[PDB]
Amino acid sequence: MNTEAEQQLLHHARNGNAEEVRQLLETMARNEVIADINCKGRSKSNLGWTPLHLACYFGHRQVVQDLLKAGAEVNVLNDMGDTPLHRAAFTGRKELVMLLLEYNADTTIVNGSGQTAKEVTHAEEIRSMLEAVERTQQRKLEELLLAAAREG
């Protein structure tokens, strides 16, 4: 099951209650409550979503920024295969994408449907941003593979 603390984290992150989120994170940082910051929702209202997925999808920037500052994993996957970046890009939230990209989100991750974040968005500025980063990550990955294969 989920702990009361991480049920509070899922609820406040989904609802954009930024001060309650931040207070929880300070308690979790000081090891005064049991709560995984990367917890997966376990209720009907959030099954398989992390607090970070919820806040990106519903557009709560202060929550996202506190979760990222607190060490949340940028590349968590939900039951659909989505990263938080898929959700922010799908909903056309340019600044959230900037933040996720800034915390080194992997853009090459393909969701359950076969789609990267670049190709679930309808905002042309986000698409361009993700295309630039994806090509950059792809080239860096291909050279690391090619090197590591030419040389054990």
Binding site: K44, L47, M80
Partner: protein
């Protein structure tokens, strides 16, 4: 011409099926609730000088399986939340019905996605959920329009679906699906 998909959600027994038949067939009957429930049901209506075909999906199948809700809610244009005015437990669940819909239907603009809330069965005694309480909740959720209804006595059923369609049509005019 244009097609609107409408989801109807709520704990079983709030009157979802009965509201459907009242809107569409002008009748109070919840018969065949395992063939049209968890199934479409259709009505050509006129919506602000636009001829709409409205598909109304009953959730009465209501399988816990999240896998159902994803493709079932997929591409919904409006979502109608229903509770029993005489059953307070059915009003408390509206939060998770709305949330479950939003993360499974996954519309591009959740904060503006058109919901309507129906407090059904207002033709009874001992209505245990107060009007002001439900309007407080509805406005809390970005001013969802709220109606008290009776599928049995046909009260505010047509009115609510006029609003449903209108608001859904301002959201489907953003995507465009004619026929």
């Amino acid at each position: 011409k244009v097609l609107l998909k409408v989801i109807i959600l709520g704990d079983s027994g709030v009157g979802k099926t009965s509201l459907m038949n009242q809107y569409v067939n002008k009748k109070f009957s919840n018969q065949y609730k395992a063939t049209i429930g968890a199934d479409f049901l259709t009505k050509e209506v006129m919506v602000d000088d636009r001829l709409v075909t409205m598909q109304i999906w009953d959730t009465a199948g209501l399988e816990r399986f999240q896998s159902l809700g994803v493709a079932f809610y997929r591409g919904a244009d409006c979502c109608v939340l229903v509770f029993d005015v005489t059953a307070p437990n059915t009003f408390k669940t509206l939060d998770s019905w709305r949330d479950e819909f939003l993360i499974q239907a996954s519309p591009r603009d959740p904060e503006n996605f058109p919901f309507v809330v129906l407090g059904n069965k207002i033709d009874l005694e001992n209505r245990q959920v107060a009007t002001k309480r439900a309007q407080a909740w509805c406005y809390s959720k970005n001013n969802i329009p709220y109606f008290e209804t009776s599928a049995k006595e046909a009260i505010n059923v047509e009115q609510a679906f006029q609003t449903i369609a209108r608001n859904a049509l301002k959201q489907e005019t953003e995507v465009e699906l004619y026929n």
